[PDB]
Point group: C3
Chain length 142, copies 3
């Protein structure tokens, strides 16, 4: 039963990358590239969690990468306080991914809590939902 945090976390991360895998077919080339890099990061996070630390996880640089994109897109979005999900068919895909990332953050927080692993992964997922939110808004603007 002690592995539940591990199994639940990876199951949710798997759901996350699979939904991102679907969403990437609804965005432009640049955004698809960003989303595939994120799938790469999730792959690394799952490796660490699934191996209970035996396999290296993500770098701190991956967190800064997200933050850089967040700063960039934040500049393009005016209204961010009162918006309902899915302004467009395409942005709806990103909002769905956004909600899964938030659920993944929670599952990973638990893993860190009981195994001390996923420290960088937790912060990465926190920022990931922020970025997915902005990407959805940008798609609606563009």
């Amino acid at each position: 039963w002690k592995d539940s945090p591990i199994i639940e976390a990876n199951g949710t991360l798997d759901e996350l990358t699979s939904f991102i895998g679907e969403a990437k077919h609804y965005v432009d080339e640049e955004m698809k590239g960003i989303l595939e890099e994120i799938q790469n990061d999730i792959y690394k996070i799952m490796g660490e969690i699934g191996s209970k630390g035996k396999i290296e996880g993500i770098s701190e640089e991956r967190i800064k990468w997200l933050e850089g994109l967040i700063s960039r897109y934040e500049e393009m979005v005016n209204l961010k306080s009162f918006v309902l999900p899915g302004g467009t068919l395409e942005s709806a895909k990103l909002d769905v991914c956004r909600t899964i990332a938030r659920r993944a953050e929670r599952k990973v927080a638990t893993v860190l809590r009981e195994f001390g692993i996923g420290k960088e992964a937790l912060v990465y997922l926190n920022r990931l939902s922020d970025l997915l939110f902005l990407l959805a808004r940008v798609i609606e603007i563009e």
Copy 2:
């Protein structure tokens, strides 16, 4: 914990509805958008732990009105496999997430005493989503 899980699931619900609304007809799209508005109201109350006002009884009556309307259009409801059509499948997905949201809010109500109306709304919402899906297939 219950508060976080509930709003996370409600967020999931409105997001999936936000996706499904682009596959239904004009009338249903409007209905789904109003539902997103209601979910927003529900998330406000749960997320503020009661400080912010939630949905009104009128919203529940609104769903019930729609349920009554679509009920008279559906003959077969007992034995149906989800997704007869792409659009109805989208709604069936929303229906299952709504049912999950109902359970999460149920916990918030028992542990925080908030969300009584929201619980009823979500109960009726899944009934409506079921009917909308069957109507589309009809």
Copy 3:
């Protein structure tokens, strides 16, 4: 009854996602997915009735294993990112939901003693969905 309620809710989510995904695959795969929906319907009946209603037969599991063996000859599985194509992405999504369902049913078997065959079916179902996703990508690459 939470395990029962939780399991059927997730199974309902599973067949609903499969019902959506079936509109994206070819005729042969669509038929396979609809048979899977039928199997999930049977699993839900057993769980929802706490055993009163008969569940799936061992033959259904054998059915999945047969399809798994088949596709195992076409897929050579590691180091692949989900959703190579929109179609395969839909299947990958179903695969993850199936894995969640498996866990929910495991709890039911544990606490109620029902769903033994269902647990194995769900375990194997995710393996099949994974192969179906890979096959779609492989066939697309060839062209």
